[PDB]
Amino acid sequence: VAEIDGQTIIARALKQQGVEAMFGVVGIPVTGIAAAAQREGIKYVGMRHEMPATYAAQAVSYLGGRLGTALAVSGPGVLNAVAAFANAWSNRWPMILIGGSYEQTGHLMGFFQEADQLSALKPYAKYAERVERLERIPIYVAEAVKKALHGVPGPAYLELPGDIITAKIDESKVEWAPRVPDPKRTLSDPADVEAAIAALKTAQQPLIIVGKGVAASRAEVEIRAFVEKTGIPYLAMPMAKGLIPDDHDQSAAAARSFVLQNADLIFLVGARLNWMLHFGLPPRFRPDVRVVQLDFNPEEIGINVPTEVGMIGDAKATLSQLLDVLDRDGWRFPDDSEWVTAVSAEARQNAEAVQAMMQEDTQPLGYYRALRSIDERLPKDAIFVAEGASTMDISRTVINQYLPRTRLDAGSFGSMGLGHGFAIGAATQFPGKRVICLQGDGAFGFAGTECEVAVRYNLPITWIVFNNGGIGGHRAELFERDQKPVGGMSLGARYDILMQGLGGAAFNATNSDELDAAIEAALKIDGPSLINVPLDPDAKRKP
Amino acid sequence: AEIDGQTIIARALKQQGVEAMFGVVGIPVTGIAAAAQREGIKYVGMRHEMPATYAAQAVSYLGGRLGTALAVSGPGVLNAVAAFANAWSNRWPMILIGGSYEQTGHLMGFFQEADQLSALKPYAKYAERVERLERIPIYVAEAVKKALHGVPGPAYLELPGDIITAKIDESKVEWAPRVPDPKRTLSDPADVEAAIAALKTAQQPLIIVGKGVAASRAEVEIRAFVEKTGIPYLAMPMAKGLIPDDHDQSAAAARSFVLQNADLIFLVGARLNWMLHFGLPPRFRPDVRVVQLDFNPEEIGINVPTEVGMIGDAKATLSQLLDVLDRDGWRFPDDSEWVTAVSAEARQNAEAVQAMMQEDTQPLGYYRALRSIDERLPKDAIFVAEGASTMDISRTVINQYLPRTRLDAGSFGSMGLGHGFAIGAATQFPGKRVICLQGDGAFGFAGTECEVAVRYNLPITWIVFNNGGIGGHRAELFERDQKPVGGMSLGARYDILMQGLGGAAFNATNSDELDAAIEAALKIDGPSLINVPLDPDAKRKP
Amino acid sequence: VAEIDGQTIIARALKQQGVEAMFGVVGIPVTGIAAAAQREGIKYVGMRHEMPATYAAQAVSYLGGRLGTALAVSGPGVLNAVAAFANAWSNRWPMILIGGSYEQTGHLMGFFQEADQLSALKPYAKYAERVERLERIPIYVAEAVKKALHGVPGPAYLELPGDIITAKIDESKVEWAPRVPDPKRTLSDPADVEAAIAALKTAQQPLIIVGKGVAASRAEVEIRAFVEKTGIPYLAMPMAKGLIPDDHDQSAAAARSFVLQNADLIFLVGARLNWMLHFGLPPRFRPDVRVVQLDFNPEEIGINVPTEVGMIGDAKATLSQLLDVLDRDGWRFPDDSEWVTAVSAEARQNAEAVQAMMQEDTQPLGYYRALRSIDERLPKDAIFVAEGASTMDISRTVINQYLPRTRLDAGSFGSMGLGHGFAIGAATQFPGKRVICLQGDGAFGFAGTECEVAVRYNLPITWIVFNNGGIGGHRAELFERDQKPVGGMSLGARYDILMQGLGGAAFNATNSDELDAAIEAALKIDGPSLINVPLDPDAKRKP
């Protein structure tokens, strides 16, 4: 009789499902699950809070293309990751949250951390089940991987009773499950593909919009071939920057407000008409704007704005279908058209207004001058993590991306507390790749001590914090008042000394020449670092 | 005269007795905090929603009414689910005010539009979304009502973003009267007489004092009950202080002895949960008789049959119990071998703990580092203890003398409440020292919140025990390729982290340095952190 | 080794907890639970739908004073009783819903009737747990009885996996639990009791209101002693009729709208200021009305109207406290007061306006003439079940009750589909007692075939149906139109022939003389019967 306990079955089933990384904080009763995960070949990363650990999991999934894993303590441990769990649902990102629970033999006794935690994750989960039998653990894991990756992706939660985790059983009595296949791709209806190309030919002022769904579909080659073979100006969403290099000739990112107001037809590829795109409604949009939609979630069609031609199914497959229809006709939107001309004139004018602020040298620095140094020195093959308000917002314009899936921001949920998790998760998915984590001072405080994880594991992560006074730029005079500012934080805080105390490199760049040197020094360091950037609390946030 | 929703919320809270609000502002709740300050509510801006909600629980437990937390829509509200549940686990009232999508933007994909109401229902005494702007004082008064009355617990109030900023004539607003404080209920006189009749027949009785006595404000009656009867009493972790821990009838030094040999147990304001080992063997005798006093009738007879059960306010019931004792004048014998054997096991176990407190080593141990804290902890200071052995051993070494002066993980064993409890305790008691003892694993959950104590200049002194992470980890464990799953940087300088945020820093590598570090930080008119590198192989047991 | 299966442990634990009756529809996997219940001493009643079976359980609890039990099939069986489960929550009535579920070995396989049914009952349940271990079944049952009876009473749901129900185990390994005690009574704060009597002495035009909470507290003797020793006119709620005999000299039931508008102070004993009492707000109430409240749920105080003196705790104990304060002073509200005089004059005038309609003889009958015969011939020791709209509403005025807990209506939830369940449940709790189930034709259709249960078990239940045209009185001309009436039902339906086909006695009373004879004939029958009463579709519903 060769025996095996529950925690080994969990870890072994995860490894058989292609899981390579796991994050979380150990404790009762999940400590052995992490120990078994390291023995089974899954690298464990001990975080300091369950919230960024869950964000690290979904980052590994989005970047790696398979599934990331988070481990949480029963009771308050699992419930501390509800927001990060919902963020994976808002962005349609798969993951697996593994959490302990009360022992079956201690149900209704007042057991340690005994609580109803299934109901808190169910409003956002593709899969939320409590293990009922020890010999069926691989089935629960296979079903968790299946519901999270297939269909519309989303987070999965697998609850494990405390007594099942430590219980042993003969190995031959364990019902193992085969590897859940990777998501399959569907072609769109050829009648809808022919109608989509037909509607584009009749468009007077068209505009292509590329969303993060194209990134998840790994359709960077096809979306560029479509944008280039049609000659239509495109507009990349925040996390779609990089699929097509942001310096492309047809990029309307500098004329975003212009192309969204004057477009008579819009090709919405892998994006949603949500708050990010102003719901496609006036005043930001043309009242009679036509919509061609490509989204493999059929429930997203015609939301807010009616869809003239809807194409559900895989973006990469449908883009290849649309290209074959284009190759049949050899069609091309006129290059000399005043639409491309008026968009180019609007883009260059707005780009020069941004160029004016970027060349403005100040001490303390401003948004555009500080972000200019990052854009100049960001490795094009690095991963850029941005979190905050205007710090994250303006970085969308200044910081260009040139490679697919190299930028991570707050996403469709606008969440705070994911910067450290995404950076730690990105560095774990790509061992040697450099990670730049730009954050505001307000965003940094949600998980500030997580920098120690980058020291304990020696991760090449470079943090850059804009201390402008907290949630918004608060002048020093506001803190002298009796009632301290509501969104104000210590203007004189030295987050580099915070990183220094945790065991990492420290930099306090107060001008452009100091920020230039502090960045290139942090890049050459084979480890973590934080560059404190005291920001002007009155810095202009518009060009 | 017009008024918007955010002002109505703040004015209603002020009318209900709310005096503090901890939150992280943002769309669409930023104006609520500003209105809270204009209506006379101290708003303490935090850096994360989880410690902000834990701070609201501390204000309620210490203040006696209701603390308030303000959360951003979507991720903000869902960042405090564990803290919201911790208030339910400890039966503590509070109010989590959260924004949400606008009513005009429902089913559009609005910013942070999500079902956050369902995530808090499993633990909420009240979870409702505002539907009418003019009815906000009704929603607030009903949130205060459900949280305080009955078995206390948290309440969640969801507010649509458009209602927060929508204006209306003030005369068209339905203001609600001040919700009264919870009423008291008397116990059945027949049950009270049987409880006294059961104590007389007990040969080895034991009183167990729980945090319900603290919530009941019954510290005067529970001490008058232990002395009138002469039974050795035992206080739960957060019950330390109701009766001063140096009482001549405290069986804390022989806890395992009294729980394993008592023939009868008087359960006051405590539950037979994991903390009390469910009242079951081997920690307890299988034939132990239970006399229970808990105003939640659903808690009687749990795990172990309750012989005589008394529901009703502990303070009022203890008055009945004393009134029945004042007739016969009965008292347990002083020379009884049960009290003598308890004193024999107690004075012996205390010597074993005292022996470990005399061992000076470099780095410091648990008992040596906790000895310097107990010698200098002022009796009228709020002591916050978070972690594993750091908190567990502090229940033994650190002494409490005033009622409701210790805050720990509670019945939920939650991690991430240390900073919030300390910031909430300092906000509740302005001119009062606060000591936040944390392990290095517990500190990382919300370490950046020390800047809040720097921003508001709170008299909070953090003390961190860096022993290698979640448990003691030798430096040799970090040299392997696979890093330890519960390990954290042994060389981490959390005092330099505090210095970077704007607070006083201290590093105590021995007992003499810790003695000077504590006495110095206690005289600082602001926050401070004492980093105590601990022996990764320190003695956990006496 | 003396073995025992799961279904026997459930039934034996229920019998040890004082459970005597069980209702429901058998099937997979709960059939053996009913068979074991009959062998363990619990009488099983096979219903035809899970909705009235659950209503029968809460009726047994309210009438018996302990706990009634309902048994439901997994999946759609349990989910068919969600409304009846919520009704027990709306009325603060205890019960236990026992339902099967998917086997643990078949979780996540698509098992027969596999579904998440815990989440549907949790918004209303005091206890909703799925059994996780076989040897701990008595603990689940003891905890279900405990949370349902103690504190604020309410429904409890106990889910049982299919494989645990049939699984056997050594009897010595079964962890049995002792009997959960009956609810304990609490005295109110003597400071609040002294203030309540103090406020009543200052009342100029007081009014006592007796709710069904006094019935649950079994305080019929104390509430009468208080109403009589204070001399204050009282007002009994619909299901509070009978605690004090409805022909009492101080009953203001005939002047309800008058006493609620002119009362300067109201003693709310065991009742809630909900929709039934017009929320205590104008125009139905005095704007500055003072409120003295007696409700052992502290969360109900000051709702809608502020409470001047609140007294939580047991009603019977608090009423005994208030009586001792009255006996100390010998206080009495003036009998000669114009308040008692104006209420008496208003009551006799309204009673005579009702007397006019009751003496009106018509064919088809009207509401007041048909209900007059029921009031004349209703046994004062029988149980009167009323369900419907005006049929149930007007019966509150015409049909008097003289004994505590003899009337059951729709309750605080206004639910339909409880008439048959309450009648069947009442006849099961009291074996030989006669039950009169008055219903409208619309109410009768929710569970019409349930009359067969009264035939199969030979229950002394007399059904009386008012066929007035459906949900409201619809004339025969309305059904001749193209669009059939929205709330209209067959005016010519013969529900007595429906009962006759099911095996019971039948009567079709079309006038007063026929209704008088049909009632007294149905009373002498040692079994079920239905009296069809074709009602005037234009019958006056107001005096």
Ligand SMILES: Nc1ncnc2c1ncn2[C@@H]1O[C@H](COP(=O)(O)OP(=O)(O)O)[C@@H](O)[C@H]1O
């Ligand atoms: N592989 C895929 N093929 C096609 N569509 C996809 C794929 N993956 C995701 N999507 C779609 O992309 C959409 C994501 O849009 P969203 O992330 O809101 O846009 P944005 O990039 O502006 O945030 C989802 O609705 C999803 O249905």
Ligand SMILES: Nc1ncnc2c1ncn2[C@@H]1O[C@H](COP(=O)(O)OP(=O)(O)O)[C@@H](O)[C@H]1O
């Ligand atoms: N005023 C009161 N009177 C009686 N019991 C109370 C009162 N307030 C709270 N309680 C009870 O005290 C119990 C708290 O138990 P618990 O917190 O587990 O004890 P501890 O944590 O101190 O061991 C709750 O079940 C609650 O019902």
Ligand SMILES: Nc1ncnc2c1ncn2[C@@H]1O[C@H](COP(=O)(O)OP(=O)(O)O)[C@@H](O)[C@H]1O
């Ligand atoms: N034994 C009892 N002692 C005191 N109050 C009780 C008791 N049982 C129930 N109640 C109270 O009576 C109230 C029921 O009122 P309700 O049924 O709405 O009034 P009505 O009779 O008008 O329907 C509940 O709020 C409950 O708290």
Ligand SMILES: Cc1ncc(C[n+]2csc(CCOP(=O)(O)OP(=O)(O)O)c2C)c(N)n1
């Ligand atoms: C969990 C969570 N809490 C709160 C918010 C609200 N929020 C959005 S951005 C932000 C902080 C913005 O400040 P910072 O990062 O310093 O940016 P800057 O002042 O440089 O623009 C906050 C609190 C959120 N999105 N998520």
Ligand SMILES: Cc1ncc(C[n+]2csc(CCOP(=O)(O)OP(=O)(O)O)c2C)c(N)n1
């Ligand atoms: C929210 C939450 N996550 C995780 C845990 C599990 N847990 C219990 S104690 C602890 C930390 C113990 O470390 P530390 O405070 O350094 O203690 P020490 O080394 O002194 O024993 C953790 C993570 C918890 N109780 N709550």
Ligand SMILES: Cc1ncc(C[n+]2csc(CCOP(=O)(O)OP(=O)(O)O)c2C)c(N)n1
């Ligand atoms: C489950 C449920 N469905 C519907 C209703 C709405 N409802 C209230 S009374 C009633 C029927 C009233 O008709 P009837 O009993 O014939 O009375 P009458 O016309 O004699 O007044 C209905 C459908 C309800 N209360 N509960």
Ligand SMILES: [Mg+2]
């Ligand atoms: Mg900032």
Ligand SMILES: [Mg+2]
């Ligand atoms: Mg530690």
Ligand SMILES: [Mg+2]
């Ligand atoms: Mg009808």
